């Protein structure tokens, strides 16, 4: 027989003569049970049949299947009371990896004490913005739609910093790379589309992909600032006299389509200062040259033979932002103004 | 007496003894359980008795039936405990079915985990956009209003290509042939019909028939593009000097009746090109020639004697979009300008 110790921190539902599990076989129970020399943790050794010693390997991962859970579930809740031993005495199960060596001799093994827990995969480590509804164990990595990752870790370091981690799977850690970016979705209201389910999750990381050396530790930034963080971005410090109502998430606009998005508004002595940001498609339009608008007020002059409304339209005014003049050739200097209306636009008058 | 084989992922709530029923009444029993050669699959072994030999056929699907699931519905929830035997010591039920040999001498059998898991049909694969609100065995396929499918897999390929797969059942076998699409609905806000039912089930595969050779894999497409990928179907690239706000899915119109859909945007260099395509009803109307006036934009004219209001309406507006002005003659040109509005397009002045 086989005779190997478990490592768990505490005894859970386990009784002395419980049974442990492969594939909801049972192959082994549970000799004995004893607190190890530090009080901290709770040592399990069971006792594997002679006929199943070659299924424990080296690189098993045990877990705990005890007691039930009833787990209620949005949009209905199935649940399922798949095996009746486990209630009243307690049970752990395990699984044996492809390839290693057979385990032998009182070799240790932690117990994890879930299915979920004992997943395989990758620990990625985050550094989170907040922790507001992030949750441990709770909240996904989404990639195309589908369940990649999991939160499996949220802390408080000292200074204000919280950090998580994160399990993934192993077909996408080849994806994970240089310039890879995780930033979280907000569940955002959609009118269009009426996903309740979206809305019901809450807060959920978005993996995107880039190219080069593979990397294990990320950085998370609020969802306005990942465009500011993507790849290929261009960053204009853009000033102006005043706000002109123009708010710290305004989209951006050449030519009626959104290019760009603004990023963050500084107040100063001088004025206010904008810092936009602009997607790779803007980017290869502006050629060094270009004028700054505000669409964020309506304008309309009275007259007799001259009728205009200038900067503005309703849908523009509930999106608002700054409108792009597009030029021919320039050198893209550091500092633009922005001007108040299109006529000071054409006239070159700041003031 | 009958001594088959079942091959299954995990032995489940089955012990040794445990009862085999056909039509839920009790035919047989599980004789013995055993881990196959490969440490991957369990092989438990039942025995029909000598009456009922005749009852398995090789074309026989078994499920497993023990336990208790608790499946909470919308709006109620039917839980019923049909079978109490199956609670305590588990259970496996079969079908026999109508025209196929008798099994004999130990042939294997799949176990399927469920009845739903277990029922007939033909394996369809999709080519998914993502899996956002996709889920595996409880996506439908629609048709008529009913449930034909059941979205059964869901994947994540490399290269990020999401692709799943589908049972139908075999009588809309026959309805599904080259252009035959399935595009998923979302959960639409609906004003006038109040569905909270369609709300909460979320995406919904839609089943379109067609006519010409059999196929059984297809492509979803998002909703706004499947109007594109329609078997009759015109597509105008139509530029513009500014997107005059006209978003990606704003509907297109000829006579106040919506004709068509715009279905994407590109912003270039020159200006912004859009792409728009036209329903067959409107595909006899062009003609080959056409005029094509923004209906996104508000205009009032003050005057005298001259009152007049262009281009647009408050519905109107709300919808927004593009407005045709047919032609008598022409050849359906590849490139059409977009009018400011309704006085330049009688102009003839793109300027």
Redesign the interface.
Same mark, same amino acid.
Do not use: C, M, T, W
């Given at each position: 027989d086989l005779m190997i110790h478990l490592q768990a921190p505490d005894l859970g539902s386990l009784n002395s003569g419980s049974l442990v599990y492969?594939?909801?076989?049972p192959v082994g129970k549970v000799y004995d049970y004893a607190i190890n020399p530090n009080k901290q943790g709770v040592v399990i050794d069971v006792l594997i049949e002679r006929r199943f010693t070659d299924?424990v390997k080296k690189g098993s991962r045990f877990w705990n299947v005890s007691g039930v859970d009833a787990n209620?579930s949005i949009? %209905?809740?199935? #649940?399922?009371?798949?095996?009746?031993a486990a209630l009243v005495n307690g049970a752990i199960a395990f699984d044996?990896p492809e390839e290693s060596k057979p385990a032998e001799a009182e070799d240790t093994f932690g117990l994890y004490e879930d299915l979920a827990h004992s997943q395989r995969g990758v620990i990625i480590k985050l550094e989170l913005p907040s922790g507001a509804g992030l949750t441990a164990d709770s909240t996904p990595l989404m990639?195309? %739609?589908?369940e #990649?990752g999991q939160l499996t870790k949220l802390d408080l370091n000292p200074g204000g910093k919280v950090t998580g981690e994160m399990t993934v799977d192993p077909?996408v850690v080849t994806?994970l790379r240089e310039n890879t970016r995780i930033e979280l979705r907000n569940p955002k209201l959609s009118?269009?589309?009426?996903?309740?389910?979206?809305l019901l999750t809450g807060k959920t990381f978005e993996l995107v992909?880039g190219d080069g050396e593979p990397r294990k530790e990320f950085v998370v930034v609020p969802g306005e600032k990942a465009l500011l963080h993507e790849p290929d971005v261009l960053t204009l410090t853009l000033t102006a006299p005043e706000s002109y109502g123009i708010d710290a998430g305004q989209p951006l606009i050449?030519?009626?389509?959104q290019?760009g998005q603004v990023i963050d508004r500084k107040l100063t002595s001088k004025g206010v200062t904008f810092t936009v940001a602009i997607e790779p498609?803007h980017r290869?339009?502006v050629k060094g040259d270009s004028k700054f608008v505000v669409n964020s007020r309506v304008d309309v002059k009275v007259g007799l033979d001259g009728?205009e409304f200038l900067g503005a339209?309703a849908?523009?005014w509930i999106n608002g932002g700054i409108r792009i003049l597009p030029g021919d050739k320039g050198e893209m200097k550091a500092s633009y103004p922005l001007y108040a209306n299109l006529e000071k636009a054409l006239e070159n008058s700041l003031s």
């Open positions: 492969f594939r909801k076989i299924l209620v949009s %209905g809740a199935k #649940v399922k009371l798949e095996s009746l044996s990639y195309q %739609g589908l #990649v077909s994806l009118l269009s589309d009426a996903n309740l389910s979206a992909p050449l030519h009626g389509v290019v498609q290869e339009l009728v339209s849908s523009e």
